Design a protein around this ligand. Structure first.
Ligand SMILES: *[C@@H]1O[C@H](CO)[C@@H](O[C@@H]2O[C@H](CO)[C@@H](O[C@@H]3O[C@H](CO[C@H]4O[C@H](CO)[C@@H](O)[C@H](O)[C@@H]4O)[C@@H](O)[C@H](O[C@H]4O[C@H](CO)[C@@H](O)[C@H](O)[C@@H]4O)[C@@H]3O)[C@H](O)[C@H]2NC(C)=O)[C@H](O)[C@H]1NC(C)=O
Ligand SMILES: *[C@@H]1O[C@H](CO[C@@H]2O[C@@H](C)[C@@H](O)[C@@H](O)[C@@H]2O)[C@@H](O[C@@H]2O[C@H](CO)[C@@H](O)[C@H](O)[C@H]2NC(C)=O)[C@H](O)[C@H]1NC(C)=O
Ligand SMILES: *[C@@H]1O[C@H](CO[C@@H]2O[C@@H](C)[C@@H](O)[C@@H](O)[C@@H]2O)[C@@H](O[C@@H]2O[C@H](CO)[C@@H](O)[C@H](O)[C@H]2NC(C)=O)[C@H](O)[C@H]1NC(C)=O
Ligand SMILES: *[C@@H]1O[C@H](CO)[C@@H](O[C@@H]2O[C@H](CO)[C@@H](O)[C@H](O)[C@H]2NC(C)=O)[C@H](O)[C@H]1NC(C)=O
Ligand SMILES: Nc1ncnc2c1ncn2[C@@H]1O[C@H](COP(=O)(O)CP(=O)(O)O)[C@@H](O)[C@H]1O
Ligand SMILES: [Zn+2]
Ligand SMILES: [Zn+2]
Length: 426
């Protein structure tokens, strides 16, 4: 007779789950036509290779492809308490074929697609480098795009997040359904090489100072943080000695992350359109923080590229009220199969713990996995390289130089450790 909360059962608490989708790159021009140079503006005059209703490898995403991905999520049977969405909604077309109003129109379409299909789902977006006109020129003060997305994303974000988003394209937000968890959505496009607006700025839009203060508050309030952004930290795995953002910013951002590794329970990025792992470590090789780069929904590649990705979306599992990452489930669309019969079959690609025989996604568990990759003829690395392209090409091979570049980028996010890895393994 005293109104005490009702105790749950002795059952095991169910894991928490969240979706990650990225790099949708809608091409509204997509349409099948005899002259394959007119199928999609994003092929920039090249002949689409073998186009179908769900797209083509030389094209960005038809609306039907993006719809099939979100329909899959909706009907998947997976419970999820939120979704992260790390940017890049307009297609790859020349700057004069876009405008601020066109960019805002595509972002609106994608946002409203999500809000219409998932009316009760909190979504945490980040801006990508194509989410601005002209592309990559994301500014260090308020702008029409920043104001537009602050209005579009208001259903998901509190007043403070809306205020920082409008001013600089970044925010942090407590997760309604997960007390003790905070999402930090960075604008890492401010650090991206092509951005003229941030040349020679030590702290563009004051995001480093803001990030430092946010993480410090999280540390003292005993919160855990998931970092999300479009462009990742670290090195490109397919090129030699090339940081994904400007070296000065990569070093500075990584030092913040190392200092707050006890608070940061995950980092999630897009932009590369590939499935990649990174493990942030200290100078002595001790693992500190796990990093997950998710592949894109668009399958687009340039004519000069041999390989591309299949469309992908992914799901993370985490410990409730604790937020340690337990697993990752990668789903994909076999685009050639879907196009041939005209019906999509989004399906499981792999479960990380099962594919690699690891216990969970903690930095030490993944560090031990990537150490296996480094062994000669590692079957684990061969599997990883197949998944890097989301199973696009089972016959794709990675020679000695290719593999050194991959493994060095997985394990060494800062310049000193990366260059030392090259010294040892080139
Ligand atoms: C996504 O869905 C696609 C479409 O179904 C799958 O791609 C098909 O995969 C099958 C099997 O891997 C392919 O069938 C085999 O093709 C081999 C030829 O390899 C390539 O080279 C020729 C060049 O002429 C291309 O035309 C061809 O499309 C391939 O890209 C043949 O060697 C095989 O024949 C022999 O082996 C098999 C046993 O393995 C026997 O069944 C045969 O009778 C014969 O003895 C076989 O024909 C098929 O070609 C692929 N189609 C396309 C369009 O690429 C993907 O595998 C799937 N993705 C995933 C991850 O599952
Ligand atoms: C885009 O493709 C057209 C058509 O390509 C042809 O059709 C393919 C299915 C295949 O049979 C190719 O070998 C063909 O080229 C290209 O125009 C045709 O190209 C060849 C050589 O010029 C010739 O057979 C046709 O007369 C050409 N013109 C037409 C109208 O068919 C065109 O060059 C391609 N464009 C680009 C940028 O690659
Ligand atoms: C990180 O925060 C600590 C803790 O300070 C408190 O943390 C939050 C609740 C926030 O709301 C702050 O206002 C609080 O004061 C800071 O530690 C303080 O450091 C100064 C020296 O600069 C010292 O005089 C205070 O006594 C310290 N307070 C405590 C409680 O130890 C620290 O400065 C913050 N770090 C950064 C980089 O800003
Ligand atoms: C997002 O864009 C898609 C594609 O442009 C819209 O679906 C199309 O809507 C127009 C009508 O305005 C038709 O011309 C197309 O045939 C529709 N389908 C496709 C596959 O193109 C969709 O309505 C837009 N959604 C929102 C919320 O704006
Ligand atoms: N996987 C890759 N292999 C080779 N070149 C790439 C690869 N990814 C990107 N590039 C190159 O890096 C630059 C950025 O490419 P984008 O397609 O815009 C990535 P996004 O669409 O996420 O912004 C391009 O010049 C592109 O040619
Ligand atoms: Zn992209
Ligand atoms: Zn990008």
């Amino acid at each position: 007779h005293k109104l005490v909360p009702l105790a749950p059962a002795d059952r095991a608490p169910a894991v928490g789950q969240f979706w990650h989708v990225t790099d949708l790159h809608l091409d509204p021009t997509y349409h099948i036509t005899d002259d394959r140079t007119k199928v999609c503006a994003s092929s920039k005059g090249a002949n689409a290779s073998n186009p179908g209703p769900f797209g083509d490898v030389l094209c960005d995403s038809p609306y039907q492809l993006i719809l099939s991905a979100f329909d899959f999520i909706k009907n998947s049977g997976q419970e999820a308490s939120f979704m992260i969405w790390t940017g890049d909604s307009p297609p790859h077309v020349p700057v004069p074929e876009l405008s601020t109003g066109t960019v805002i129109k595509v972002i609106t379409n994608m946002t409203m697609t999500v809000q219409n299909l998932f009316p009760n789902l909190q979504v945490f977006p980040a801006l990508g480098n194509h989410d601005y006109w002209p592309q990559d020129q994301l500014p260090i003060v308020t702008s029409k795009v920043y104001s537009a997305v602050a209005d579009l994303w208001k259903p998901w974000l509190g007043e403070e997040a809306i205020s920082t988003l409008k001013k600089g394209g970044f925010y942090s937000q407590k997760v309604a359904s997960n007390p003790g968890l905070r999402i930090i959505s960075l604008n890492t496009n401010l650090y991206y090489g092509p951005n003229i607006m941030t040349l020679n700025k030590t702290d563009p839009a004051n995001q480093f100072e803001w990030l430092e203060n946010t993480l410090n508050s999280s540390l003292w309030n005993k919160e855990k943080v998931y970092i999300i952004a479009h462009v990742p930290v670290g090195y490109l795995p397919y090129a030699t000695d090339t940081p994904a953002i400007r070296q000065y910013y990569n070093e500075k951002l990584l030092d913040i992350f190392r200092r707050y590794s006890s608070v940061i329970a995950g980092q999630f990025y897009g932009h590369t359109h590939r499935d990649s792992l990174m493990v942030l470590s200290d100078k002595n090789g001790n693992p500190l923080n796990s990093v997950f780069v998710a592949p894109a929904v668009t399958p687009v590649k340039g004519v000069l590229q041999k390989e591309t990705n299949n469309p992908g979306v992914r799901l993370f599992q985490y410990k409730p009220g604790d937020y340690t990452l337990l697993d990752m489930v990668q789903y994909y669309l076999n685009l050639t199969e879907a196009n041939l019969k005209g019906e999509s079959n989004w399906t499981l690609e792999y479960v990380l713990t099962q594919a690699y025989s690891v216990a969970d996604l903690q930095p030490k568990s993944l560090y031990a996995l990537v150490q296996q990759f480094a062994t000669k003829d590692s079957k684990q690395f061969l599997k990883y390289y197949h998944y890097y392209f989301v199973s696009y090409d089972s016959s794709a091979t990675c020679d000695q130089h290719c593999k050194t570049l991959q493994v060095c980028a997985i394990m060494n996010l800062d310049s000193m450790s990366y260059d030392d890895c090259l010294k040892q393994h080139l």
